[PDB]
Write a protein that binds this DNA or RNA. Structure first.
Ligand SMILES: [K+]
Ligand SMILES: [K+]
Ligand SMILES: [K+]
Ligand SMILES: [K+]
Ligand SMILES: [K+]
Ligand SMILES: [K+]
Ligand SMILES: [K+]
Ligand SMILES: [K+]
Ligand SMILES: [K+]
Ligand SMILES: [K+]
Ligand SMILES: [K+]
Ligand SMILES: [K+]
Ligand SMILES: [K+]
Ligand SMILES: [K+]
Ligand SMILES: [K+]
Ligand SMILES: [K+]
Ligand SMILES: [K+]
Ligand SMILES: [K+]
Ligand SMILES: [K+]
Ligand SMILES: [K+]
Ligand SMILES: [K+]
Ligand SMILES: [K+]
Ligand SMILES: [K+]
Ligand SMILES: [K+]
Ligand SMILES: [K+]
Ligand SMILES: [K+]
Ligand SMILES: [K+]
Ligand SMILES: [Mg+2]
Ligand SMILES: [Mg+2]
Ligand SMILES: [Mg+2]
Ligand SMILES: [Mg+2]
Ligand SMILES: [Mg+2]
Ligand SMILES: [Mg+2]
Ligand SMILES: [Mg+2]
Ligand SMILES: [Mg+2]
Ligand SMILES: [Mg+2]
Ligand SMILES: [Mg+2]
Ligand SMILES: [Mg+2]
Ligand SMILES: [Mg+2]
Ligand SMILES: [Mg+2]
Ligand SMILES: [Mg+2]
Ligand SMILES: [Mg+2]
Ligand SMILES: [Mg+2]
Ligand SMILES: [Mg+2]
Ligand SMILES: [Mg+2]
Ligand SMILES: [Mg+2]
Ligand SMILES: [Mg+2]
Ligand SMILES: [Mg+2]
Ligand SMILES: [Mg+2]
Ligand SMILES: [Mg+2]
Ligand SMILES: [Mg+2]
Ligand SMILES: [Mg+2]
Ligand SMILES: [Mg+2]
Ligand SMILES: [Mg+2]
Ligand SMILES: [Mg+2]
Ligand SMILES: [Mg+2]
Ligand SMILES: [Mg+2]
Ligand SMILES: [Mg+2]
Ligand SMILES: [Mg+2]
Ligand SMILES: [Mg+2]
Ligand SMILES: [Mg+2]
Ligand SMILES: [Mg+2]
Ligand SMILES: [Mg+2]
Ligand SMILES: [Mg+2]
Ligand SMILES: [Mg+2]
Ligand SMILES: [Mg+2]
Ligand SMILES: [Mg+2]
Ligand SMILES: [Mg+2]
Ligand SMILES: [Mg+2]
Ligand SMILES: [Mg+2]
Ligand SMILES: [Mg+2]
Ligand SMILES: [Mg+2]
Ligand SMILES: [Mg+2]
Ligand SMILES: [Mg+2]
Ligand SMILES: [Mg+2]
Ligand SMILES: [Mg+2]
Ligand SMILES: [Mg+2]
Ligand SMILES: [Mg+2]
Ligand SMILES: [Mg+2]
Ligand SMILES: [Mg+2]
Ligand SMILES: [Mg+2]
Ligand SMILES: [Mg+2]
Ligand SMILES: [Mg+2]
Ligand SMILES: [Mg+2]
Ligand SMILES: [Mg+2]
Ligand SMILES: [Mg+2]
Ligand SMILES: [Mg+2]
Ligand SMILES: [Mg+2]
Ligand SMILES: [Mg+2]
Ligand SMILES: [Mg+2]
Ligand SMILES: [Mg+2]
Ligand SMILES: [Mg+2]
Ligand SMILES: [Mg+2]
Ligand SMILES: [Mg+2]
Ligand SMILES: [Mg+2]
Ligand SMILES: [Mg+2]
Ligand SMILES: [Mg+2]
Ligand SMILES: [Mg+2]
Ligand SMILES: [Mg+2]
Ligand SMILES: [Mg+2]
Ligand SMILES: [Mg+2]
Ligand SMILES: [Mg+2]
Ligand SMILES: [Mg+2]
Ligand SMILES: [Mg+2]
Ligand SMILES: [Mg+2]
Ligand SMILES: [Mg+2]
Ligand SMILES: [Mg+2]
Ligand SMILES: [Mg+2]
Ligand SMILES: [Mg+2]
Ligand SMILES: [Mg+2]
Ligand SMILES: [Mg+2]
Ligand SMILES: [Mg+2]
Ligand SMILES: [Mg+2]
Ligand SMILES: [Mg+2]
Ligand SMILES: [Mg+2]
Ligand SMILES: [Mg+2]
Ligand SMILES: [Mg+2]
Ligand SMILES: [Mg+2]
Ligand SMILES: [Mg+2]
Ligand SMILES: [Mg+2]
Ligand SMILES: [Mg+2]
Ligand SMILES: [Mg+2]
Ligand SMILES: [Mg+2]
Ligand SMILES: [Mg+2]
Ligand SMILES: [Mg+2]
Ligand SMILES: [Mg+2]
Ligand SMILES: [Mg+2]
Ligand SMILES: [Mg+2]
Ligand SMILES: [Mg+2]
Ligand SMILES: [Mg+2]
Ligand SMILES: [Mg+2]
Ligand SMILES: [Mg+2]
Ligand SMILES: [Mg+2]
Ligand SMILES: [Mg+2]
Ligand SMILES: [Mg+2]
Ligand SMILES: [Mg+2]
Ligand SMILES: [Mg+2]
Ligand SMILES: [Mg+2]
Ligand SMILES: [Mg+2]
Length: 116
RNA sequence: GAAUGAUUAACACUCAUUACCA
RNA sequence: UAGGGAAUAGUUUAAAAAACAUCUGACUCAUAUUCAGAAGAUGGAGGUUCAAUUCCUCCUUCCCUAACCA
RNA sequence: GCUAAACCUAGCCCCAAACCCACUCCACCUUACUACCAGACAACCUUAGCCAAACCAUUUACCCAAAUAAAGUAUAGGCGAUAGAAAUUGAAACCUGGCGCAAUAGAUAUAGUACCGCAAGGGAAAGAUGAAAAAUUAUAACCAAGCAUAAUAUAGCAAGGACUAACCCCUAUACCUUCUGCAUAAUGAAUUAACUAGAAAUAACUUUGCAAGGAGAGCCAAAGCUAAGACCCCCGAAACCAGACGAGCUACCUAAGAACAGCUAAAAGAGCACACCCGUCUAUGUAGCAAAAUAGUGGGAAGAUUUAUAGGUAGAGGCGACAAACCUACCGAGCCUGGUGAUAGCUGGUUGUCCAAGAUAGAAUCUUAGUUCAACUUUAAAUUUGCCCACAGAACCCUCUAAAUCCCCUUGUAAAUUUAACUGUUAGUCCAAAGAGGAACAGCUCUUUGGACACUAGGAAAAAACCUUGUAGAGAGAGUAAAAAAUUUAACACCCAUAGUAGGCCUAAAAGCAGCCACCAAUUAAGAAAGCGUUCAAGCUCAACACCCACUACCUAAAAAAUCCCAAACAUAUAACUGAACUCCUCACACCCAAUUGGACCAAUCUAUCACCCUAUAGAAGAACUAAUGUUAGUAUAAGUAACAUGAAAACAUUCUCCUCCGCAUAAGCCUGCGUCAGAUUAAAACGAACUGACAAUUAACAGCCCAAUAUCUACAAUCAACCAACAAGUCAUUAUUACCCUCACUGUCAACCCAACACAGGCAUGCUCAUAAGGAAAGGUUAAAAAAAGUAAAAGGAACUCGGCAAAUCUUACCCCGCCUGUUUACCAAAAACAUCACCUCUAGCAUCACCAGUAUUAGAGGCACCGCCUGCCCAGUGACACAUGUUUAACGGCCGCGGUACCCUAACCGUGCAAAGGUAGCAUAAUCACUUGUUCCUUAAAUAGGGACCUGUAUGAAUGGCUCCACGAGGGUUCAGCUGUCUCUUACUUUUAACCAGUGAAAUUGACCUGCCCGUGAAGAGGCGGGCAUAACACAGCAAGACGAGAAGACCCUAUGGAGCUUU
RNA sequence: CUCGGAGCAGAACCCAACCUCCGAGCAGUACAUGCUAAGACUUCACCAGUCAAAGCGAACUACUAUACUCAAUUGAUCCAAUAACUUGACCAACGGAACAAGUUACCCUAGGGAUAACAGCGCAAUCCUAUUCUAGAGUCCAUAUCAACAAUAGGGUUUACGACCUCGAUGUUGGAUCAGGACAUCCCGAUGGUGCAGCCGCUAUUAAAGGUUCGUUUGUUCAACGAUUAAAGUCCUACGUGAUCUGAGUUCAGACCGGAGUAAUCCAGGUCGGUUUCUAUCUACUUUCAAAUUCCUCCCUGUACGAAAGGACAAGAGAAAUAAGGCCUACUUCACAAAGCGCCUUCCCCCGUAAAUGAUAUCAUCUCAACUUAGUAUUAUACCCACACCCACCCAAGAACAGGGUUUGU
RNA sequence: UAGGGAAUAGUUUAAAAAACAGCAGAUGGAGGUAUUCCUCCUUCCCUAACCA
């Protein structure tokens, strides 16, 4: 019985974050429902979709979730993204995946309240 | 260590040169 | 096989200094001692920091310890 | 037919009621049960711990004076576990009963007896007629295991299907527990009978009552509330604490006793050697003679000796020449009782029938042998989707542009979620697939997806994990599913060869063929040469011509293990057939998973009411046993086995043979225990009797049982006590005065005997006998096998045996290590080098009326070391102790060095430099001293890892936790000369025992059941029991030890447990 | 030992190893990092953690301004401090006990084959063997002999690995005793090759009937050494065999030395000492009756061979050892007999190859062509073989039983 | 962490001086009415904490 060695690799024991899409294409969401969670921007917020401080995407309106591909124009103040687009060959357009909520209900209705 | 010179009255030294198991 | 420590001038130590050794001079008839001068160093490689012997990392050499119970 | 079986009483339990309490005479706290004398001692003083807190450390309910209620409230608490009031409230109360037991129950109880223990203390078993036994030839019978009547016939979990037929044929791997998985060679179990194990709240559910109320004050209430039904086991540690009991064993001590021949020396912890004490070595023995013995051999035996008697020290302790010894057979700390039903996440066990549902992501945890939450699983309830899935849709960065997934209408289907209430599972195996670790090893380890297994059946030889197949019954129908192993191998050309030229160059030589360049040309045809060869050449081939139909294939290679190959066989008759619990068929249908969960029934018993040859509806409960190394009893198996016993003849008078270990007596112990008579009860055999009943008996002079007061007295051992010389300094003695006229009581007295469970080869003090005047018998009979035991003798050799000369024989030499010596120790595996010890040294203490001590520093106590001889070096920084102003102290705890260079190499008188309290000094050294190591050399042997003497840096020797020499001593360890021998070469013969046979008597462990073969294979991985073969009428007796993973002891090694205990400690 | 990122885990989520890599236990800027509140996420439970519309109050009409940048950057309850707000652990064993280390070989109990040591089994890295390949060595020459880089198989003796049976026990080294088996043969037999003249060797094929020594030191298995031998084989059998033995070693309780430790005590160390039970129920077995192996001497022969030196084989003869089976005349132990140290007997084959003839293929060719020879045994033969006289007696027969004799039953 | 106290030349003292160390040299820092009055901060000491 010879004495053995030991592994020099510590840590690495974190559990899965359980991130990803919570509401798939066509699903009905109420306002506030989290649509997806992510560590980096895999899906970008579209129409009526808010983005949390932790990049969490949530519904701003009640409706149907839709995923589309759209042209990506960064904010002129986002230095890193602007540096990329300026170095692109002319004629080249960046695309990204966006998630939207199509509002299902109208903001309200006018109802007869009195006959004065 | 060897040879060679330099050195000495001649040497030694020194310097320089050469070639099982429970 | 596992573990801890160390590496500084040619030599041996210190927190970039002393000691001698080495070279220079003086004293001696000459040598030593002595006196006055002079030079010389942070095992290797990589990185942090404006700056690293002094913060970390791997390798080499060496040392010390353990390597058991039926 | 035996053994047995059966019984209904004895009494007992729980309540009620009631307060309770004895007495002849005599004896009884001293040694209890003892007629009768001078004393004066006197009682109180907090429970602890197990356990719970998942350890444990504060803490952890224990009637304390009225049931209920307030209330598990206030409050307390590692604010944890758990503990827990009061104010206030306020009831009933008629002993003579029982849905209690009925001889393993109920009290332990026929009895606190027998029996066990020194003691405290522990503590049984069992009986059965009838009206009458002054009816006893009575009261029938049938029933457990075990046997008998009546042994057995190839073959195999002992049966099943069957059959004319018991067997023969075919099929079939006991049971429980425990596991991933057990025929397993894993656990338990000889068998029978009896006994022997699920206790309850919180909620919820079900069924009644009443209902915004319910309830027979308290409580609850936004349909509640009241009542009922229905769920929560048994045995087991090592421990801990309290109070008693123990020093008749043993350790040590106190008082007063006893023993020690002979010889040598005559001085002796001196030698030889009895008694006596001890226990070195070997054999025997190992449920024995013996819970430590016997035989031989050994150590001691005038001393630190051995030993009888009484007394002392007691468990948080004693005692100890320290062995963790010994303290009543078992002491890392006694025993008993109690706390106590200690606790156990650990093993084992857990009792009627039938059906149903039912296999598993993970998280935390002093946690991974367990728990809680999730998940899965079960039941009840609610109302609404569940599952399968169409498009569309879900990322860039990056190398496998993976198999897929997610989402999802339709559709095919019938589930799903939610509410209420719980338990169990949370120690996992193989296969396919994607990977990781390892060795692209594992029946290996780790994740993922799926399957199977832990449930069925068929198949793959046997076969958990592969294939086929699942839903349950009957059938002497039927169709099928999976389902059988194929292959066979290496020929090959014939014929012929002149030449520019030995091409050029290089080279000693290079001539087709060491290298470099060219590679042209003669002959119809032949490379300025493709393979050999020659030192260079020669020489043999191939590519050429001619001859001429070689008319090639151009794909490939073996083998070996251990008990014995392994179905038998077969190349030839027409695609089929066989084959399940699948499916069909006639009839029927709840009727094949562990843990767990739901449900339907039910034996017997008691009670209410029925019933009335053994029942019904209900209510109850000590309500069901193929398993706990279970408890008690009975009887088997081993087994008529192991083992045990009586000297001979005779007229039972006596005599003979042989032992003598003794023997007689006293003390202690014991208590009628071989005397008579009468019984046939019996001695490990036997009708004499030690057993039963009765009747007798031991007679004091021996011994025990003693003494008026007060004061006073007592320097001068003993040893033949005389010479002589001692130390350890000793067992023996009065007087004065007063008082005192009396007599022979009382008790022990036996034996073949005590302590050891026994009629035990053991233990057991003293006197005398010293081999006997006393006391005894080794052989039940026979035979004369093996193996075994105890002896005797042995050719030639003489340690060649062996770890070792163990044992035996003979009887001796020299040396080494350790310890000075005599002595002491682990009673029962160690007798030693361990302890003690004379000697030496350190430390403490200036003193009296209970040890030390009736002592006083030349003393006493606490320690170290270990006579003597030579010695005991350096260090006080650290720790300790002492001392105080620094400090002192090692024969206190302890310690006592590097790195680099210099005489060729080894080495360094030497030199540099750092460190320290000091740097290991003298000695000794391959050691009983870490390895290296069988170091080197001399001696020893034919040969030596042995032994002796040296050399040694031992970098881990070393100086009172002592170093080194040396006399004497040693059942210490090692070596050796000589001799001796059956130790051996190499065994043999005889005797005794045992043995075997006959007769009597008659155990133990063990035992699931057995109808109890061998081979290969298989398998929970080593098969009498499975597969394939082979073998095979039946049954004794004697041997053997290869297997039955043989018996015996719940492995002492190892790990685990929030299990113990002893010891040490900063 | 807690936390985060990446791979394993390629595409929703999840996913382990004492697996592979890299990090964290802060820092910086704000000071509305103010208040409040729909709807959601969630590390597979809980605890904890995460994102947020609207609204209030601010800011604001220049600020990718509105839950700050940032991946992790962290700690429950009780309790303590504090007027309040609020703060407090490398509680890092990081779901955290308010506070507790050693040692036990003097040990104990409960369990575990859920887990080690022995053996089996699995596996074959390691170990051993064979073949393939043709570099190299062997003067030349690959293949007499040896052999690199590699390749393909086999073996199951080593050291490991795994943890499947066994811990209500499968007794652990070496030796004694008795051996069963494999052949990968050490000796003896039969053959091919040789860098084989001969004598000796080397290598390969075949052969497991028979055989395979005694001693000094060591506990040894081994190893060294002495002396022999035809040879002193390699292995398996629970590293065969302790209900047959042994107990030197190893591995309990005593003790010493060196070393470690404050000590208790301890060490792969060394050293002295240290209890080895069992009456056999079952299986199996208790005359495989009887063919023998080997060395040496003489002779062949100083022949064959060879320059010499040296020096055979076959046949023949003799004498021994061992083994097996018997026996007692003598010797010896002994004495109506049993014994050895004495005497007597002992018998067949071995298949690897070497050669003819002769086809496929009109030569040739020893032929998994037909065939011929070396070249083979029904292994030979041997032993055993007739039986109610049998009460009893005797016995060279024997445990009992059985057997022989009794014409040897006063 | 809490308070108490303290800070003079490199060092240690005095009431702006001497002594040592190497003619230089100082009133820890900031603010205020100046070593000498007060306050905050730094460093250090003292004393008590450092629990959960
Ligand atoms: K997110
Ligand atoms: K405990
Ligand atoms: K009783
Ligand atoms: K069982
Ligand atoms: K088995
Ligand atoms: K098993
Ligand atoms: K067992
Ligand atoms: K006493
Ligand atoms: K068990
Ligand atoms: K547990
Ligand atoms: K099949
Ligand atoms: K040439
Ligand atoms: K008596
Ligand atoms: K005895
Ligand atoms: K002794
Ligand atoms: K000191
Ligand atoms: K020696
Ligand atoms: K020597
Ligand atoms: K002795
Ligand atoms: K046997
Ligand atoms: K923890
Ligand atoms: K392996
Ligand atoms: K075991
Ligand atoms: K020996
Ligand atoms: K059997
Ligand atoms: K004899
Ligand atoms: K041919
Ligand atoms: Mg990860
Ligand atoms: Mg994880
Ligand atoms: Mg001159
Ligand atoms: Mg507890
Ligand atoms: Mg404990
Ligand atoms: Mg009250
Ligand atoms: Mg009773
Ligand atoms: Mg019967
Ligand atoms: Mg059969
Ligand atoms: Mg198992
Ligand atoms: Mg099975
Ligand atoms: Mg069994
Ligand atoms: Mg078990
Ligand atoms: Mg209950
Ligand atoms: Mg306690
Ligand atoms: Mg007590
Ligand atoms: Mg006594
Ligand atoms: Mg006395
Ligand atoms: Mg005498
Ligand atoms: Mg004496
Ligand atoms: Mg004597
Ligand atoms: Mg004593
Ligand atoms: Mg001791
Ligand atoms: Mg001891
Ligand atoms: Mg006792
Ligand atoms: Mg219990
Ligand atoms: Mg079912
Ligand atoms: Mg914890
Ligand atoms: Mg678990
Ligand atoms: Mg759907
Ligand atoms: Mg789980
Ligand atoms: Mg596995
Ligand atoms: Mg030519
Ligand atoms: Mg030429
Ligand atoms: Mg040429
Ligand atoms: Mg030619
Ligand atoms: Mg040539
Ligand atoms: Mg031509
Ligand atoms: Mg040709
Ligand atoms: Mg069916
Ligand atoms: Mg059916
Ligand atoms: Mg009935
Ligand atoms: Mg019952
Ligand atoms: Mg029963
Ligand atoms: Mg039982
Ligand atoms: Mg018997
Ligand atoms: Mg007998
Ligand atoms: Mg008298
Ligand atoms: Mg008498
Ligand atoms: Mg005695
Ligand atoms: Mg007599
Ligand atoms: Mg007798
Ligand atoms: Mg007898
Ligand atoms: Mg007899
Ligand atoms: Mg003899
Ligand atoms: Mg010998
Ligand atoms: Mg001798
Ligand atoms: Mg021998
Ligand atoms: Mg002897
Ligand atoms: Mg002694
Ligand atoms: Mg003893
Ligand atoms: Mg004794
Ligand atoms: Mg003894
Ligand atoms: Mg001693
Ligand atoms: Mg002395
Ligand atoms: Mg000293
Ligand atoms: Mg030198
Ligand atoms: Mg010295
Ligand atoms: Mg040594
Ligand atoms: Mg010897
Ligand atoms: Mg030392
Ligand atoms: Mg010493
Ligand atoms: Mg000392
Ligand atoms: Mg003496
Ligand atoms: Mg001696
Ligand atoms: Mg003695
Ligand atoms: Mg017998
Ligand atoms: Mg008999
Ligand atoms: Mg048994
Ligand atoms: Mg088998
Ligand atoms: Mg028999
Ligand atoms: Mg069996
Ligand atoms: Mg056994
Ligand atoms: Mg056990
Ligand atoms: Mg405890
Ligand atoms: Mg969650
Ligand atoms: Mg807002
Ligand atoms: Mg934790
Ligand atoms: Mg966590
Ligand atoms: Mg010991
Ligand atoms: Mg045990
Ligand atoms: Mg296992
Ligand atoms: Mg093993
Ligand atoms: Mg086995
Ligand atoms: Mg293999
Ligand atoms: Mg060559
Ligand atoms: Mg094997
Ligand atoms: Mg496993
Ligand atoms: Mg067993
Ligand atoms: Mg054999
Ligand atoms: Mg062979
Ligand atoms: Mg063996
Ligand atoms: Mg055996
Ligand atoms: Mg021994
Ligand atoms: Mg020691
Ligand atoms: Mg002894
Ligand atoms: Mg020993
Ligand atoms: Mg034995
Ligand atoms: Mg026997
Ligand atoms: Mg011949
Ligand atoms: Mg021919
Ligand atoms: Mg021909």
């Amino acid at each position: 019985k010879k004495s053995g060695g030991s592994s020099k690799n510590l840590g690495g024991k974190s559990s899965g974050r359980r991130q990803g899409i919570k509401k798939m294409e066509g699903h009905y969401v109420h306002a506030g429902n989290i649509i997806a969670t992510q560590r980096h921007f895999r899906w970008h917020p579209g129409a009526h979709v808010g983005v949390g401080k932790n990049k969490c995407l949530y519904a701003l309106e009640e409706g149907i979730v839709r995923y589309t591909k759209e042209v990506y124009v960064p904010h002129p103040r986002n230095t890193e993204a602007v540096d990329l687009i300026t170095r692109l060959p002319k004629g080249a357009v960046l695309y990204k995946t966006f998630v939207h909520v199509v509002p299902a209900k109208p903001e309200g209705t006018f109802k007869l309240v009195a006959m004065l």
